[PDB]
Design a protein around this ligand. Structure first.
Ligand code: 1RY
Ligand SMILES: OC[C@H]1O[C@@](CO)(O[C@H]2O[C@H](CO)[C@@H](O)[C@H](O)[C@H]2O)[C@@H](O)[C@@H]1O
Ligand code: CA
Ligand code: NH4
Lengths: 415, 553
DNA sequence: TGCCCCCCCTTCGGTGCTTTGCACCGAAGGGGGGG
C-alpha cells in the first residue's frame, strides 16, 4: 500500500532505445538466475515487442567480491529522465566529505526494490536478455519497482532514506553521509577501528529496517590523502637546444593556463640554426625568465572555481610505464583538479584494465568532491574500449565517455 | 479447440491515420491466382470480408515461393509501417552451426502458415484493409481486412517471433533435457535421448504447437540427415554450407561483381583463405550497376585463387564446451587477414576474414589488433567466451608497440606462431636527439587562394633547399618538407618541424597509407637507421624554424 | 515496386581539430545469407 511517485521524461524526448550488446556465457547465466529470482518476487515482469524502448544490461563483480551483481546501463534513461532537482528531490552534497580521514562506500541499492515504480514509467525500463549463439530470441523485461542505477531511485527513496538514518545521525553528529546512485558514502575523522565499528552499526541499523552486491560490503577511501599533479618544469644545470625547444613548447602551451608566462627571452637562445644536441648556456635574461615562470606555475590559476550548473569533464593521458595523468574541468584551461595514477591493477600488462581502473578512480573522486560524475575523454579507439571495458568494471554506476586520439607532441603533464 | 494466442496491443503513431493507397494495375495472371488464395483465408477464418465502413486500403501484389509452385501474397504496407508505432525487435542475431553441440537425435520442423496462425490486434485489423480487382476492374471487387499477422507489415516478424517464444516457454521449462533453436517458424530440436524417446518428445512438441493453432506439416518435417537448416547441411559429426554458385560469366557488370564478392564473403565462414581485396577494388567508383568492368590482372588471379579454395568441399565441426577455443590468424597481404577457430588442430569450427581499411594511415599491428577484436566479439556471440589466440607477431614486437603507443591498446591471452609473413614494426623513432646527426629544420606553406606553395629546410651545417609546389595545401607542404629532409640526409637525422599534422601521422609508425606522399615518407623512414622527430611552435623566433619559415613563406 | 535480423565493401555527409583541409565515423545502398 505505497503510493507511487509519478515520473515524467524531459519534454520532447522519447525513451531509451539502446541495443543489447553480446554477453559472455558467465554473464548471461548470472543474469538468467538473477532475473528468474526477480520475476518470482515481482520486481520485474516479462514484456513483448510492442514496447519500443530498451536499455543494455550486463553483470559485474565488485572488488574482492565473488558473486555477480546485475548492472543496467541506464545512462540513456538517466539523461532523458526529468531532473528531480526541479522537483526539489535533489540530494545536496556536503563539502566536508572530502575532508574526512576515512570514507566507506556501502551498496544500498537493494533497498530500492521495496518501493513500487510509477506504472506509466515502467515501460521506459525495458531491457533484453540475449542468448548464446542466438538459440532463443531476446527475452524482454521491465521494472515494477525502483531499479538500481536509475537516477530517480535514490531521489524517490530519499524520503524513506532520511528516516532510516535519523537515529544514527543523531547519535553520531560528526559523521557525514552522502547518497549517490546505489551507494552511501560515510565519512569520519575517527580511528579506523572506531570508524569500521560505526560502519558496522549503520549496517545493522539498516537491517532493523530490513526486517521492518548485498549490504555487507564496504570500500575504504581516504580523501584527506588525495594529492594533485601540477605542471612542472625540469631542473637542469645544462640545457641542449632540444631541451630549450621542448621547454619553449611546453611553456608556450602552459601560457593558455597561466597568462603571465613569457618565452621571449628563452626563444632568443634558439636564435641560430644549431644542432639539437648542442649545449647552450642560459643568458642572464633567460635565467630570470625561467625562475619567474616557475613562480607563476606555483600559484593558483585565477578565476577557476566550481560551477554547480556546468558538467564536469575529465581528460586522461597514457604516459607509459603504468603512469596515467588526468585533469578535471568545466571550462577549458580552468582545471579544478589535476592528478596522476601509477602501479594500478594491470600495470605493465593491460592498458584497458588500467584505464578502466583510472576512470573508476576519477569518478569516485568527483562524486566525493562535487557529487557529480564527469564525462570522460578516453585515449583509446572506440572498438578497443567497447570490446573489453566490461571485463574490468567494478562500480555500480557508469559515467559518460567519448573517444579521442591526441598524439603527445608536448609532454605537458609528465616529464 | 485451440488455445487462443493472446493478441499483442498495437497502436499507430500519435495524430496519424490509417493508410489510403488504393491499388496499382495487376496482370490478369496475378489477379486470377490471388482471388483463390483470399477465399482460402476466408474459409479458415484468417480474413473477414465486411469492408464498406472501412476507408483505408493498401496495395497488394504477389510473387512465387523459392522454387515452389505456390504464389506468395504480399501487401505493400510501407505507408502503414510509417504510421505504425515502433517495435523493439527480439531477433538479435543469426545462429551458427559452429555454436551447436553434438546431439544423438535431431529434428527440424517448420510451422505451416506462421503469420496466419497468430491473431492480429482487434482494433488494428481495420488499417490492414486491401482491395483485389474482381475482373480487371470490371466490377468493384472483394475487400478484406486481416484477422492475423500479414506479410509486408513491419510488426509481423517481431510479433510472431515473440508469440512463438511465449508458446515454447512452458515446453522448454518442463523439458530441460532438450534444445530448441527457434528462428522465425524454423525449428531445430536436438537431444541425446534414445531415438524412440526423441520421436516421442517431438510429437509432444508437435501436439503442443497444434494446441495453440500452429501446424507442423510432414512435408517440412526433417527426420533424416543431412538436415537443411539456416542455409547449411547438418551431419552427425560435421556441418557444411549449402553449395555455393559462383557466376562464371565472361562479361562482368558492376552488379555481377557485387554478387560475386557477396558469395565469396558468405563462403569465407568455412572456406579458409578467401580474398576479395582486388575484386572489390574493381567496384570502387561511381559506375552504374550495368557498366561492364574488365577484370584486372590482380583481380583475375584473386578470383582464380578463390576458385581453387572452393573446388574442394570443406566442413566444419561442432562445439565441445569442455575444450578451449583456439583462434589462429594469418596475414594475407594488402591489409587482408584470414583466421580459423578450432578446438582440436585441423578441425575448424569456422573460418572468417578481416580486410577493413579504417583510417587514412595505419600499420599491420593496428590491423591485427582490429582482427582480434572482430574474432573476440564473434566468439562471444557464438560461444560466449574468448578464444586463446595464435598470432603471427613476436611478443617483443607487440610489447614495443603497445607500451610506446599513446592510445591504450591490448590483446587477450595469446601466443606467437611462426607462420610468415610475420607482423612487425617497420621503423622506430628515436626518443632523444641523435648526437652528430645533421639537424634539418623543415617547413612548408601554401597560398590558400592560388594553391601554390613551397617546402624546404635549412640545416645546422648550412644545407638549404626550397622547392616550389603547385596545386597543394599547407598540410601537404609540411609533409613535403619532411620528405625532402629524409631524402637529403644521411642514415641518421634530426628533423625539427612545426607541423602537428605530420607528426601525429608519423609518430604512429604507419606502414601503409592512402596518400602517395605518406607512402613515400614511409619508404624513406624504413631506409633510415635513426630518425628523431621534434615539434616546435611557429612564429616564436626559434632556431632554424624562424629561418625556414621565412624561406617557404 | 512488401517486412524483420546478421555479415562485408563503398560512398557520403556531418563533426571536430590536424582546422577552412583532413581525419574520423555512422548511415545507407549495393551485395551475400536466414525466415
Ligand atoms: N520472403 C519472405 N517474406 C516473408 O514475409 N516471410 C515471412 C517471415 S517467415 C514467414 C513464414 O511463412 P509461412 O509458414 O506460410 O511461410 P513458409 O513458406 O515459411 O512456410 P509454409 O509454407 O507455411 O510451410 O513468412 C518469409 C519469407 F521468406
Ligand atoms: O561507448 C559508447 C557507446 O555506448 C552506447 C551504447 O551502449 O551508448 C552508451 O554510451 C554512450 C557514451 O557514454 C552514452 O552516451 C549512452 O547514453 C549509452 O547508452 C553507444 O551509443 C555508444 O557508441
Ligand atoms: Ca513455414
Ligand atoms: N608560415
Amino acid at each position: 500500500p505505497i503510493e507511487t511517485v509519478p515520473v515524467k521524461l524531459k519534454p520532447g524526448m522519447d525513451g531509451p532505445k539502446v541495443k543489447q550488446w553480446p554477453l559472455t556465457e558467465e554473464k548471461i547465466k548470472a543474469l538468467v538466475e538473477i532475473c528468474t529470482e526477480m520475476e518470482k518476487e515481482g520486481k520485474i515482469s516479462k514484456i513483448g515487442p510492442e514496447n519500443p524502448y530498451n536499455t543494455p544490461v550486463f553483470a559485474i563483480k565488485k572488488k574482492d567480491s565473488t558473486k555477480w551483481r546485475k548492472l543496467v546501463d541506464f545512462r540513456e534513461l538517466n539523461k532523458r529522465t526529468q531532473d528531480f532537482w526541479e522537483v526539489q528531490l535533489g540530494i545536496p552534497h556536503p563539502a566536508g566529505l572530502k575532508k574526512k580521514k576515512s570514507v566507506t562506500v556501502l551498496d544500498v541499492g537493494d533497498a530500492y526494490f521495496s518501493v513500487p515504480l510509477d506504472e506509466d514509467f515502467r515501460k521506459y525500463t525495458a531491457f533484453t536478455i540475449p542468448s548464446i549463439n542466438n538459440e532463443t530470441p531476446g527475452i524482454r523485461y521491465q521494472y515494477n519497482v525502483l531499479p538500481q542505477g536509475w537516477k530517480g531511485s535514490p531521489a524517490i527513496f530519499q524520503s524513506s532514506m532520511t528516516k532510516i538514518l535519523e537515529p544514527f545521525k543523531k547519535q553520531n553528529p560528526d559523521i557525514v553521509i552522502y547518497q549517490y546512485m546505489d551507494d552511501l558514502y560515510v565519512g569520519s575523522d575517527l580511528e579506523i577501528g572506531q570508524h569500521r565499528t560505526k560502519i558496522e552499526e549503520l549496517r545493522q541499523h539498516l537491517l532493523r529496517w530490513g526486517l521492518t552486491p548485498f549490504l555487507w560490503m564496504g570500500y575504504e577511501l581516504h580523501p584527506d590523502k588525495w594529492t594533485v599533479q601540477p605542471i612542472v618544469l625540469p631542473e637542469k644545470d645544462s640545457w641542449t637546444v632540444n631541451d630549450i625547444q621542448k621547454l619553449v613548447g611546453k611553456l608556450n602551451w602552459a601560457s593558455q593556463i597561466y597568462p603571465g608566462i613569457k618565452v621571449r627571452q628563452l626563444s632568443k637562445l634558439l636564435r641560430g640554426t644549431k644542432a639539437l644536441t648542442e649545449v647552450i648556456p642560459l643568458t642572464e635574461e633567460a635565467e630570470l625568465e625561467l625562475a619567474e615562470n616557475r613562480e607563476i606555475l606555483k600559484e593558483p590559476v585565477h578565476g577557476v572555481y566550481y560551477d554547480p550548473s556546468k558538467d564536469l569533464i575529465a581528460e586522461i593521458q597514457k604516459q607509459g610505464q603504468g603512469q596515467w595523468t588526468y585533469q578535471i574541468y568545466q571550462e577549458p584551461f580552468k582545471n579544478l583538479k589535476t592528478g596522476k595514477y601509477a602501479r594500478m591493477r594491470g600495470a605493465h600488462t593491460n592498458d584497458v584494465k588500467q584505464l578502466t581502473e583510472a576512470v573508476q578512480k576519477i569518478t569516485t573522486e568527483s562524486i566525493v568532491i562535487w557529487g557529480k560524475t564527469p564525462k570522460f575523454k578516453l585515449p583509446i579507439q572506440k572498438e578497443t574500449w567497447e570490446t573489453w571495458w566490461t571485463e574490468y568494471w567494478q562500480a555500480t554506476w557508469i559515467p559518460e565517455w567519448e573517444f579521442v586520439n591526441t598524439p603527445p607532441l608536448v609532454k605537458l603533464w609528465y616529464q | 479447440p485451440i488455445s487462443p494466442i493472446e493478441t499483442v496491443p498495437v497502436k499507430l503513431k500519435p495524430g496519424m491515420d490509417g493508410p489510403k493507397v488504393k491499388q496499382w494495375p495487376l496482370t490478369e495472371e496475378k489477379i486470377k491466382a490471388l482471388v483463390e488464395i483470399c477465399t482460402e483465408m476466408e474459409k479458415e477464418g484468417k480474413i473477414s470480408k465486411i469492408g464498406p465502413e472501412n476507408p483505408y486500403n493498401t496495395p497488394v501484389f504477389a510473387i512465387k515461393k523459392k522454387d515452389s509452385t505456390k504464389w506468395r501474397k504480399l501487401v505493400d504496407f510501407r505507408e502503414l509501417n510509417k504510421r505504425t508505432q515502433d517495435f523493439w525487435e527480439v531477433q538479435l542475431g543469426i545462429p551458427h552451426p559452429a555454436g551447436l553441440k553434438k546431439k544423438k537425435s535431431v529434428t527440424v520442423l517448420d510451422v505451416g502458415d506462421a503469420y496466419f496462425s497468430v491473431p492480429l490486434d482487434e482494433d488494428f485489423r481495420k488499417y490492414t484493409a486491401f482491395t483485389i480487382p474482381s475482373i480487371n476492374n470490371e466490377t468493384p471487387g472483394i475487400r478484406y481486412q486481416y484477422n492475423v499477422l500479414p506479410q509486408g507489415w513491419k510488426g509481423s516478424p517481431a510479433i510472431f517471433q515473440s508469440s512463438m517464444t511465449k508458446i515454447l516457454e512452458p515446453f522448454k521449462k518442463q523439458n530441460p533435457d532438450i534444445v530448441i533453436y527457434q528462428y522465425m517458424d524454423d525449428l531445430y530440436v536436438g537431444s541425446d535421448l534414445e531415438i524412440g524417446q526423441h520421436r516421442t518428445k517431438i510429437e509432444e512438441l508437435r501436439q503442443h504447437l497444434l494446441r495453440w493453432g500452429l501446424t507442423t506439416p510432414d512435408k517440412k518435417h526433417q527426420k533424416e540427415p543431412p538436415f537443411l537448416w539456416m542455409g547449411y547441411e547438418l551431419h552427425p559429426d560435421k556441418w557444411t554450407v549449402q553449395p555455393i554458385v559462383l557466376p562464371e560469366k565472361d562479361s562482368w557488370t558492376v552488379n555481377d561483381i557485387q554478387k560475386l564478392v557477396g558469395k565469396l564473403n558468405w563462403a569465407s565462414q568455412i572456406y579458409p583463405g578467401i580474398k576479395v581485396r582486388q575484386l572489390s577494388k574493381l567496384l570502387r567508383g561511381t559506375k552504374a550497376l550495368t557498366e561492364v568492368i574488365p577484370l584486372t590482372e590482380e583481380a583475375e588471379l584473386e578470383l582464380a585463387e578463390n576458385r581453387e579454395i572452393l573446388k574442394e568441399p570443406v566442413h566444419g565441426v561442432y562445439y565441445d564446451p569442455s575444450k578451449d577455443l583456439i583462434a589462429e590468424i594469418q596475414k594475407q597481404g594488402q591489409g587482408q587477414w584470414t583466421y580459423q577457430i578450432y578446438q582440436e588442430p585441423f578441425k575448424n569450427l569456422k573460418t572468417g576474414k578481416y580486410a577493413r581499411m579504417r583510417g587514412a594511415h595505419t600499420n599491420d599491428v593496428k590491423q591485427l589488433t582490429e582482427a582480434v577484436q572482430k574474432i573476440t566479439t564473434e566468439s562471444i556471440v557464438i560461444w560466449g567466451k574468448t578464444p586463446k589466440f595464435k598470432l603471427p607477431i613476436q611478443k617483443e614486437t607487440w610489447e614495443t608497440w603497445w607500451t610506446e603507443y599513446w592510445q591504450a591498446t591490448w590483446i587477450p591471452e595469446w601466443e606467437f606462431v611462426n607462420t610468415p609473413p610475420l607482423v612487425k614494426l617497420w621503423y622506430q623513432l628515436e626518443k632523444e636527439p641523435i648526437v652528430g646527426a645533421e639537424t634539418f629544420y623543415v617547413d612548408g606553406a601554401a597560398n590558400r587562394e592560388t594553391k601554390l606553395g613551397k617546402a624546404g629546410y635549412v640545416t645546422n651545417k648550412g644545407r638549404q633547399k626550397v622547392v616550389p609546389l603547385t596545386n597543394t595545401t599547407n598540410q601537404k607542404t609540411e609533409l613535403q618538407a619532411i620528405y625532402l629532409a629524409l631524402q637529403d640526409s644521411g642514415l641518421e637525422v634530426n628533423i625539427v618541424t612545426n607541423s602537428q599534422y605530420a607528426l601525429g601521422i608519423i609518430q604512429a609508425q604507419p606502414d601503409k597509407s592512402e596518400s602517395e606522399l605518406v607512402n613515400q615518407i614511409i619508404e624513406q623512414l624504413i631506409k633510415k637507421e635513426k630518425v628523431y622527430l621534434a615539434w616546435v611552435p611557429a612564429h616564436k623566433g626559434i632556431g632554424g624554424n624562424e629561418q625556414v619559415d621565412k624561406l617557404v613563406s
